[PDB]
Amino acid sequence: ESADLRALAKHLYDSYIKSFPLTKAKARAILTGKTTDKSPFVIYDMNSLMMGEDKIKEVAIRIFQGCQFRSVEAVQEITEYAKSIPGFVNLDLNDQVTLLKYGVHEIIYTMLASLMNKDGVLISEGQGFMTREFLKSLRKPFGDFMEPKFEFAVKFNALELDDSDLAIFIAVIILSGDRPGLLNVKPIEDIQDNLLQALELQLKLNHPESSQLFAKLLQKMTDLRQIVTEHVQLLQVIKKTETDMSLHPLLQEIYK
Ligand SMILES: C=C(C)[C@@H]1CC[C@]2(C(=O)O)CC[C@]3(C)[C@H](CC[C@@H]4[C@@]5(C)C=C[C@H](O)C(C)(C)[C@H]5CC[C@]43C)[C@@H]12
């Protein structure tokens, strides 16, 4: 029944709003020269980075650890969202952990695109905006952490998804079932099939002039995969040349 799929979409969207403090809708209102209400302080170089530390509250490394923090917070938020997905907490606990382990980074880059445009990315709950060029200009093992994320975002943002779309898409990603190490794949797959039906209907209703958006959205999952892969191998480099830099245990247990 279409009706049941709509109720599912609304529940996920509702849970999404409750779990993620910075929505795409708020991010777009901040980014677009829309408001005096609160536009961001813009960090595009060293001194503005400093002054930025006063307005908003070594460079390259310190920025990297600022990233590390926000990812941890993002993992907490995504974990909270995951529990609201019907069926998820009824799964074998080990599989819940596995689904989170592999899904969380793909979600983080999906939602990261909401905070990006071509020029840079919102930081600190949208109070700040850090320039793409400034991130690229950073010291050499760090200066290209962010670039492939920008490249993803620019293309992904061209699908023009809104938060109600993204809420279902993010659920679809979590409930994959082709994740390494899963004990019971069939209950995961039955949940994903429901989610996929919901997403498909959502996209047809919300974007009726956007043909095959559903298929085009699913194809984006390959882009996410390779961002993660490339990000991971970049992290292995950093941990060897920067022996004094530390990773977060919540983040470290995710990579393996
Ligand atoms: C170890 C890291 C540096 C964390 C976990 C890996 C990470 C990850 O997988 O998230 C790569 C992308 C990103 C550096 C995050 C942190 C969160 C962060 C984000 C949102 C918040 C802090 C930063 O100020 C800013 C604006 C550059 C963004 C952009 C990218 C990421 C997603 C990484």
Residue numbers in the entry: 207 to 263, 276 to 474
Q: What do the study's own words say?
A:
The results indicated that only one molecule of BA binds to the PPARγ ligand binding domain (LBD) with a Kd of 4 μM. There are two independent protein molecules in the asymmetric unit (chain A and B). In chain A, there is clear density in the region usually occupied by PPARγ full agonists where it was possible to fit a single molecule of BA. The first BA molecule has all its methyl groups engaged in vdW contacts with the protein environment (L453, F282, M364, C285, L330, V339). The carboxylate group makes H-bonds bridging the hydroxyl moieties of Y327 and S289. One of the two oxygen atoms is also engaged in a H-bond with the side-chain of H323. In contrast, BA contacts the Y473 OH by vdW interactions through a carbon atom of its 5-membered ring (shortest C-O distance: 3.1 Å). The H-bond network involving the triad Y473, H323 and H449 is less stable than that realized by full agonists such as rosiglitazone, as denoted by the slightly shifted position of the activation function-2 helix (AF2 or H12) from its active conformation, with the consequent loss of the H-bond between the H449 ring and the Y473 OH (distance of 3.6 Å). From the crystal structure, a steric clash is seen between carbon atoms of the ligand and the ring of H449 (shortest distance 2.9 Å). Moreover, the environment around H449 is different than that of the complex with rosiglitazone, because the F363 side-chain changes its conformation owing to a steric clash with one methyl of BA (3.0 Å), and approaches H449 (3.3 Å), L453 (3.6 Å), L452 (3.7 Å), and the methyl group of I456 (3.5 Å) which is slightly displaced from its original position.
Peroxisome proliferator-activated receptors (PPARs) are a group of transcription factors belonging to the nuclear receptor superfamily. As such, the three PPAR subtypes, designated α, γ, and δ, bind to fatty acids and their metabolites, and consequently regulate the expression of genes involved in the transport, metabolism and buffering of these ligands within cells. PPARγ is a critical factor in the reciprocal regulation of adipogenesis and osteogenesis. Among the ligands, we identified betulinic acid, which is already known for its anti-inflammatory, anti-tumour and antidiabetic properties, as a PPARγ and PPARα antagonist.
